[PDB]
Design a protein around this ligand. Structure first.
Ligand SMILES: *[C@@H](C(=O)O)[C@H](O)C(=O)N[C@@H](CC(C)C)C(=O)NCCCCNC(N)=[NH2+]
Ligand SMILES: *[C@@H](C(=O)O)[C@H](O)C(=O)N[C@@H](CC(C)C)C(=O)NCCCCNC(N)=[NH2+]
Ligand SMILES: [Ca+2]
Lengths: 215, 215
């Protein structure tokens, strides 16, 4: 795998979204991974619908939380997921209104990265594209991040509470990192992104719950 | 639905097991629901293997915890689950050693009970058979239960931490309850069972994470 890769430079990443108060991080993380694979397989970059997931992934709990693997399993069983334009995000749970006419992507399954293995996560990001991951984003330092490579020894790798998207990895001034796309709007962090310490003992649990959809 | 049903009286429930220190409650709960459906569809009552689930349901975390829906999805995708005799429980994680020769049951999917709806749970238990459920089993009062219908206002329906099996429901001396099969051995509770308050505002979260396998 290359020493660094940034899928934003390949046009695999859509604009940063804002999930609002709804606990739908899992939906944005899942949509992000699917958007990356969609670009890789079709050549087109499109916004997919997290609301479609929020309202229809019955295995999850809508704004009450959920898992990315569950989301991928839904898309596979449902035979598709709508584009954002065909099923707009409103930040609240509603009845499932999936319309196949607005289908913009399909999923043939998913794969998980070996728990805690950052080397495997690196290889998966290099070979596949953006990967859905989960971290502990409860620290004040995380929420007020603005630049540099984030590391706080207080992060608890066993307290995963927020799903995000690893769109790449690299090194900044000698500090290896993961390029993370968040869903808290373009004004949070560095234009919606945060560089998180890589190879620093699985900081914040970055490699504890990673997965990607098959397409 | 009848005013009461006890599947143990129909021979749909296997002996009470002991999960040990391993956090495999989800595996025993899932196996319990599958054993019930297996009896209903074949007429034979057999012990299914929670170890098969612990070692092979990659979507879960073995002794670190997991979900029943994930377990059912595995059995469906794997095209089967081994009997206990063909894949013995040891209470620790090992590599997946599933052997189709020992297949004792199949799964065609799963269904979830509407969140928090005890009426729906009652109807599901009556029409389907034993149903996998999750509760807050952290209270000292729960752990030292011995008889009667269990109710502790301190139970938190939002703090689900232990999966069990609803093998029936009824009423004891005017107190409506759920007949719950635990996995803490035959010496815990009442021969491994506990009667939990039913229709008392979803006590302990009994109807918050219920599901059953399709067969
Ligand atoms: C994340 C966010 O919006 O900031 C959101 O709370 C979320 O989905 N959190 C997840 C945790 C990460 C994926 C680690 C969560 O809490 N998941 C558990 C959901 C409850 C389990 N039950 C069901 N139905 N799956
Ligand atoms: C229950 C027990 O053994 O007493 C055991 O801890 C367990 O599986 N608990 C579940 C909770 C109930 C089903 C509500 C649990 O903690 N599940 C979450 C597992 C972590 C999520 N990640 C994966 N890989 N599914
Ligand atoms: Ca699942």
């Amino acid at each position: 795998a290359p020493d660094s890769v940034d899928y934003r430079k390949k046009g695999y990443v859509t604009p940063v979204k804002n999930q609002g108060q709804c606990g739908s991080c899992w939906a944005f993380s899942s949509v992000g991974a699917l958007e990356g694979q969609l670009k890789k397989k079709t050549g087109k970059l499109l916004n997919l619908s997290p609301q479609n997931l929020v309202d229809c992934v019955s295995e999850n709990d809508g704004c009450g939380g959920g898992y990315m693997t569950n989301a991928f399993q839904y898309v596979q069983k449902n035979r598709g997921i709508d584009s954002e334009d065909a099923y707009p995000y409103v930040g609240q749970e509603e009845s499932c209104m999936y319309n196949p006419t607005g289908k913009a992507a399909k999923c043939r399954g998913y794969r998980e990265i070996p728990e805690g293995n950052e080397k495997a996560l690196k290889r998966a990001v290099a070979r596949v594209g953006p990967v859905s991951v989960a971290i502990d984003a409860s620290l004040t330092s995380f929420q007020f991040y603005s630049k540099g490579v984030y590391y706080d020894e207080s992060c608890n790798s066993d307290n995963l509470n927020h799903a995000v998207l690893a769109v790449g990895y690299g090194i900044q001034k000698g500090n290896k990192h993961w390029i993370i796309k968040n869903s808290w709007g373009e004004n949070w962090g560095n234009k919606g992104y945060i560089l998180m310490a890589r190879n620093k003992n699985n900081a914040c649990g970055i490699a504890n719950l990673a997965s990607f959809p098959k397409m």
